[PDB]
Design a protein around this ligand. Sequence first.
Ligand code: ZN
Ligand code: ZN
Ligand code: ZN
Lengths: 49, 827
Amino acid sequence: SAAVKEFFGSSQLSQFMDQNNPLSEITHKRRISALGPGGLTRERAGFEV
Amino acid sequence: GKALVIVESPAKAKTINKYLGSDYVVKSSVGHIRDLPDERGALVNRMGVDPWHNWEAHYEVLPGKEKVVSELKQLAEKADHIYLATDLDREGEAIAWHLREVIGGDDARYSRVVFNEITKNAIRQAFNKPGELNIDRVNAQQARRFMDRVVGYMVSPLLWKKIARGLSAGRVQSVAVRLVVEREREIKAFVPEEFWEVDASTTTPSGEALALQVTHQNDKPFRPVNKEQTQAAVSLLEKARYSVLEREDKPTTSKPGAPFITSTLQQAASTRLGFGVKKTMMMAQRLYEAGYITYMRTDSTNLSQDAVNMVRGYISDNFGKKYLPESPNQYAHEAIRPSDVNVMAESLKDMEADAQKLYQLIWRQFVACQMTPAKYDSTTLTVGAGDFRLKARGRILRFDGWTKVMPALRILPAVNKGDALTLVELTPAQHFTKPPARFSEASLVKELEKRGIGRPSTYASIISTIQDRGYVRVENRRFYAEKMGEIVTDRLEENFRELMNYDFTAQMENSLDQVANHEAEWKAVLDHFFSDFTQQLDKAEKDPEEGGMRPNQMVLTSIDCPTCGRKMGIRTASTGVFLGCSGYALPPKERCKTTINLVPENEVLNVLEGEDAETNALRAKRRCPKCGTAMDSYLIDPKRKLHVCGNNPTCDGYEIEEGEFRIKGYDGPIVECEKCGSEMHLKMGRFGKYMACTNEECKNTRKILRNGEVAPPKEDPVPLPELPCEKSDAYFVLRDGAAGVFLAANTFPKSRETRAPLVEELYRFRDRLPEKLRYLADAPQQDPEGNKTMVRFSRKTKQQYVSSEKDGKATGWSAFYVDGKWVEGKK
DNA sequence: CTCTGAATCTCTTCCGACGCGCCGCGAAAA
RNA sequence: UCCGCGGCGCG
DNA sequence: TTTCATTATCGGAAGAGATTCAGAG
Ligand SMILES: [Zn+2]
Ligand SMILES: [Zn+2]
Ligand SMILES: [Zn+2]
């Protein structure tokens, strides 16, 4: 329970929905990222990526 | 770092490690771990202490604690500060001292702590206000240990020379035997006093029955000694007028007993469950290790406050107020009791039935001792009849109190002073003052503790040693003194009076306390002791005429030696009591080594006779012609039986009697002949002690060895000249038995050198091996690592296997024989 | 052929704008 | 109740 | 050969160290 709760609450892949407009919700739900655990980092990201 | 704590009992350790958890490493010594193995160097080497060199000693790890001591050494590095937590008494103090000298290190690395109880309120205070080991206490124990050593290793040899080989003497051992010897002589020399009793059945003015006992005649205790006198009295009582004189009603009380200390537990188990001392301790041991009760070895009947609140709490909920006393019952390790009062015997389904019975005994004693007493209304009726006085006593239970938890397994009719009684019948009864009861195992222990003779952890051990040594024997769960016991007891009392005095231990304890309290120095105390002892020993060594211990004394008798017909005499050896032919004392030319075994007639006390049973046993004995002493009885032929006086050999009376008798021919150990299944029996001769089989068609004989009951079988022996011995100049021979197949040295009783064979060895001498053994030579000679392989017996499966060792440890590789093939793998 | 000195490689060490809004999280001990 | 971190957006 | 009692089973650049190769005697 603790691990699941902390994952759903604190992971950088658990973003805070903005819900300004319906399109905002859609574009945030369909967002794809290469960040998070197992991914890249902003500094290490080369120009090629 | 991590702290290392050391206690004596493993069970107690596991329990301590709990109420302390990790960060600490608790372990147990499981006992002592170390002990002992003008002047004579050999004697000193044997004793392990030098009385002539300021008591320098030579301690050495017990042949069965190697592992135990070794694990502490590796574990000691991890521990920062070592905490010796053995018992506070001198024995425990000494175990701590030995641990500290076997583990090494620096004094500051050691600390001494004492655990009150298991409660955290104790295991905590343990490390709170600790201390270090006390030297005075340690030296006090060394003094006791050394005095016991000197006596045993210096007196026994004297016995070997004057009396017989294999004999022993000891501070505790020898007085235990003396007690049995004195009771034996007491029984044999006694004389029953026939006495009569008369009871009268009567009717009250109402019509109720009233039984009366005659107590006085002409104001003198009524006690006729014969039938004639009993009749003279009955004649008068038959015509007398009976009237009530007094009726004394009075409230009387009774009380539960104390919880069972090791000694009392043994006695209670013996009286209520028929358990022998050793058995009782075995069951108690199981119960302790399973956490149901506390330490099976204790001399204190004390109870902690928690224990007392726990039981009162239980009594309160299960019996009510009338059973709970206003305040805890008072009375003069802790006492043996259940670890949890809420646990009933019936719920221990993981224990044997007998262990449940023992638990129930311990439980009930613990709750009763805290329960209320049994109130009774006792009535005593006094009756007059002519010049006679008669009495009747009754009792009616009013309140069970403590007997509610510990049950054991009377109504006098209403009559007032002055009332007349009607005589119905008079019943005379003949009786015989009975001899003192014979000792039992628990009963002797009780006597020992009463005189402070032994120790809780040694009582059982004492009872066995005196039997194995042949001094006394047990029959019908009762002790009987053997002739040898009497012989040794008389010799020891003659030359070592001080040592044979019952209070020698008490006197020793006083001197030991003085050493423990800086009121005396230990070496000085041992020096005084040794001076007195040597004065007695030297005097005993001399010839009987100079006051020297009397050597044995053949007492002849009219019997025909089957080898030479001569008169035969009665003799005592460490093996027992036996019939010998005087040619034993004649040089070889005229020497006769024929001997006869003397089967005694075992006294069979009738439990149904109660107190009579011992008296009738004394009545059963013949009486010696030359003296009043009773006589003890032995069987020499199915046609002949032999009587011998109690004071033999001081008294020389003997009697021989004819009749038809079930003579067994032997007495001592039992062994089953592997070659014919018959009984096999233990025998003595020019080579000491051998073991030989009763079937006349079979002469198969085994033999005694240093540290076991009997050798394995003398079957299919094959000699090898080409294997030399290494500790001795001998050569090695190959032998088979239940133990296995083994190499042993041709002068075996002298060399006593044995080792398992290697496979390569067998292969080298494979032509010699009998047809069956050949398979072992087929076995793989070397393991996959190229280590070398040895031939072992798997006792659990009664088969040979081959196994390899490196640095003397097992490699963990084994090969076995399975259907004509040899199959190999990790152990 | 063997050693010493300089080059080359391998490993270690630094450092990668600047403001400013938001959001939601952190730690328990017996 | 003063702190740090993670993400998002603005230039 | 042998006796006693007791106790309890990112990538790029710079710097320092280590290793190797070429030149001399
Ligand atoms: Zn003879
Ligand atoms: Zn006599
Ligand atoms: Zn046989």
